[PDB]
């Protein structure tokens, strides 16, 4: 025999782990890559083939006549389901911001108002229902348009909170909508699909998930600001969880160090709630890296259900 055979040859075991995982992430199998691309195109099929122009006309057609409700400023049309997740919990799942003027009555007051005035106006044309956050307008063709009720104050517009429900959130809907739209456009329209895929994966977790839809969208903006990887969901989705596992431990901010008021429910920095979220996001990041390294398509399928 001979002298040698230690696990790390006197190296840092974590440096060896990085060298191995870096070598894995640099080689790819064309067969497994085609299977993964076919998986994501099916999960995003209802989203990329949604009649967005018909959504826009129906929005103008349902708000022309009711002076109280008014369409928002920035065009979203981020409604639409991916991976069979039928939840609306953030700006990435709504089609427009329906702004009412007259606050003190509460978000659920403005929601039911938009609901009632649209259900009477669209009676015999589409069904209207109020949800946990947004009003949904289902039509005969099966199209569901999501409308997020909002109010206008002397301080600006206010969107409902994703968890408190009986209060308005502290987010500036103008800033948020700008970032989500600007990044998505700068992300070849792949940021919003990646966010919905991430929320779909988190939904499959048997564990108790505590992150709101606004905060997940905020985490994605922080993740893909300096993202130089491939513009595919197969590469963008793992980047979100590997970035959010660290970013969720600190209060959310913009580039200059100013609070965006999306992470207040998670307590102070390095709190128990943030640590629990970091481990859940980290286990999903490990499962994604191990499924890709093993070329296991069934493991990627189970992540979405």
């Amino acid at each position: 025999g001979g002298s040698g055979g230690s696990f790390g040859s006197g190296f840092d075991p974590r440096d060896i782990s990085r060298q191995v995982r870096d070598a894995e992430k640099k080689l790819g199998d064309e067969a497994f890559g085609a299977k993964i691309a076919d998986l994501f195109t099916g999960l995003l099929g209802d989203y990329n083939n949604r009649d967005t122009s018909l959504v826009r006309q129906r929005i103008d057609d349902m708000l022309e006549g009711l002076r109280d409700v008014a369409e928002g400023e920035l065009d979203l049309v981020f409604g639409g389901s991916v991976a069979k997740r039928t939840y609306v919990d953030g700006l990435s799942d709504v089609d427009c911001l329906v702004i009412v003027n007259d606050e003190a009555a509460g978000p659920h007051a403005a929601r039911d108002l938009v609901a009632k005035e649209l259900a009477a106006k669209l009676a015999g044309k589409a069904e209207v229902s109020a949800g946990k956050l947004a009003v949904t307008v289902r039509y005969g063709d099966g199209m569901e348009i999501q409308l997020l009720p909002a109010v206008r104050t002397e301080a600006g517009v206010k969107i409902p909170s994703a968890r408190v429900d009986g209060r308005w959130s502290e987010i500036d809907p103008g800033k948020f909508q700008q970032a989500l739209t600007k990044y998505n456009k700068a992300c070849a329209g792949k940021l919003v699909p990646a966010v919905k895929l991430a929320k779909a994966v988190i939904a499959q977790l048997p564990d108790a998930h505590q992150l709101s839809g606004y905060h997940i969208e905020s985490l994605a903006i922080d993740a893909f600001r300096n993202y130089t990887g491939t513009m595919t969901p197969a590469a963008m989705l793992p980047h979100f969880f590997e970035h959010a596992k660290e970013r969720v431990l600190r209060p959310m901010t913009d580039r200059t160090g100013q609070s965006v008021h999306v992470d207040g429910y998670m307590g102070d920095a390095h709190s128990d709630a943030r640590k629990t979220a970091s481990h859940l996001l980290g286990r999903l990041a490990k499962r994604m890296a191990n499924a890709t390294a093993a070329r296991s398509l069934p493991q990627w399928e189970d992540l979405f259900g």
Partner: protein
């Protein structure tokens, strides 16, 4: 059917899901075990197994929050010169492992993730089967976020002669079945691979006996943990016989490849490449072995829905043995 989805339940909700393949860490045979934990923690997303013996003597220092859950083994493996069927060489002097040392470790263990505590066992401290149930109910604490698992052991201490009687080498399956109603006090039942039978058929038959006994006392969801079994052939066979949790050190000595548990240098030649840097081979084998364990775990979880087509290897053997022993 003997194979079923089981696990560890808190308030009727499934906390740990079986069939579960558990990567094990131990200082016995691996003096650099802490370096293995640190490297493999970047790929281990699910539960893993450590030893209270190694926690007490400082062989391992964590952090253990990387895993989904932690199985705290009592330390009877490290406290024993006896080995499992997958040991291929050992140059091991066990130190003292008293009941007080074991109780102090599991008593002070605190973790944000679920914990499974295994009952104490020592090669010189064996009891009759019914008395083993009484010891585990008294030593294992009934605490939040902590499950209780009793590992049955033989009833007789080693004699020291040329041969050893079955009361030393095997557990009393008949006594386990007789006292099977007392298993409601615990969350899981445990038996080592080497001591539940002499060959593969006898181990499968005795596992099936324990499973049928648990299903009669309305413990149809109670997991059976086979300590030491963690390979590409015997582990699926024990699952078809009624077992649920499987751990071992085989992933640290061998390499799983195309349904076979092979020699690592051959795995590096036929899969990793002949020019792979030598300081990366052992960690790459450990990383690939854990991903293989989860793929094999999924095949066992798919057997309940897709049948034998879920297994990618040894399908004729798995079906033949399942027919013969059932």
């Amino acid at each position: 059917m003997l194979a079923k989805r089981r696990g560890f339940y808190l308030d009727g909700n499934e906390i740990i899901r079986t069939p579960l393949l558990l990567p094990s860490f131990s200082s016995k045979g691996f003096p650099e075990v802490q370096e293995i934990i640190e490297a493999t923690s970047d790929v281990i997303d699910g539960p893993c197994l450590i030893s209270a013996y190694d926690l007490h003597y400082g062989s391992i220092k964590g952090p253990y929050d990387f895993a989904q859950a932690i199985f705290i083994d009592s330390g009877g493996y490290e406290a024993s010169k006896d080995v499992e069927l997958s040991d291929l060489g050992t140059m091991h002097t066990p130190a003292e492992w008293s009941q007080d040392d074991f109780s102090r470790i599991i008593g002070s263990w605190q973790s944000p993730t679920p914990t499974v505590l295994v009952s104490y066992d020592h090669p010189k401290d064996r009891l009759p089967t019914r008395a083993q149930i009484e010891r585990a109910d008294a030593m294992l604490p009934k605490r939040p976020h902590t499950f209780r698992e009793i590992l049955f052991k033989p009833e007789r201490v080693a004699t020291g002669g040329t041969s050893e009687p079955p009361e030393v080498t095997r557990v009393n399956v008949s006594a386990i079945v007789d006292n099977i109603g007392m298993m409601a006090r615990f969350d899981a039942l445990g038996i080592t691979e080497k001591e539940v039978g002499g060959n593969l058929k006898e181990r499968m038959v005795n596992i099936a006996r324990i499973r049928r006994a648990l299903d009669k006392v309305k413990l149809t969801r109670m997991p059976i943990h086979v300590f030491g079994s963690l390979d590409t052939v015997t582990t699926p066979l024990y699952f078809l016989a009624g077992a649920d949790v499987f751990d071992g050190l085989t992933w640290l000595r061998f390499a799983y490849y195309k349904g076979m548990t092979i020699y690592r240098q051959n795995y590096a030649a036929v899969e990793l490449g002949i020019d792979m840097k030598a300081h990366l081979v052992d960690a790459k084998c450990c990383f690939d072995n854990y991903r293989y364990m989860k793929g094999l775990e999924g095949e066992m979880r798919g057997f309940l829905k897709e049948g034998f087509a879920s297994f990618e290897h040894h399908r004729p053997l798995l079906e033949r043995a399942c027919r013969a022993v059932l």
